[PDB]
Design a protein around this ligand. Structure first.
Ligand SMILES: CCn1cc(-c2cccc(C(F)(F)F)c2)c2sc(/C(N)=N/C3CCS(=O)(=O)CC3)cc2c1=O
Length: 101
């Protein structure tokens, strides 16, 4: 396990603690979010991120941060602003980027 993998696994643990319901834990299904796959072109979730870290697919922190932002942006695009998902996405995007400095 490389130094970048160790750091990313660390950041990921810290980020996932901010989503105690695990709304962002696994790919969003069309069943729970109708028409999701026809709206969101590039889905992302923490489970997929973990698998990318394990596969050594991230070669910079920048790349990891981009997938995190993608996840949050997806939630903010698909959901109306008055929803728990949108509000949590906006909260964790800011907190996560700060956290990661
Ligand atoms: C943040 C990612 N995400 C996750 C979910 C989700 C995943 C697992 C379990 C649950 C549940 F058990 F709590 F329901 C929700 C959902 S569900 C959803 C959905 N059905 N959202 C609607 C909210 C009302 S609206 O904005 O009018 C249309 C979309 C969007 C997302 C999502 O982005």
């Amino acid at each position: 396990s490389t130094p970048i993998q160790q750091l990313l696994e660390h950041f990921l643990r810290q980020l996932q603690r901010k989503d105690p319901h695990g709304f962002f834990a696994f790919p969003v299904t069309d069943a729970i979010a109708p028409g999701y796959s026809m709206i969101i072109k590039h889905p992302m979730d923490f489970g997929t991120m973990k698998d990318k870290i394990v596969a050594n697919e991230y070669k910079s922190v920048t790349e990891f941060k981009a997938d995190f932002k993608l996840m949050c942006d997806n939630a903010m695009t698909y959901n109306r602003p008055d929803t728990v998902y949108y509000k949590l996405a906006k909260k964790i995007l800011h907190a996560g980027f700060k956290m990661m400095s």
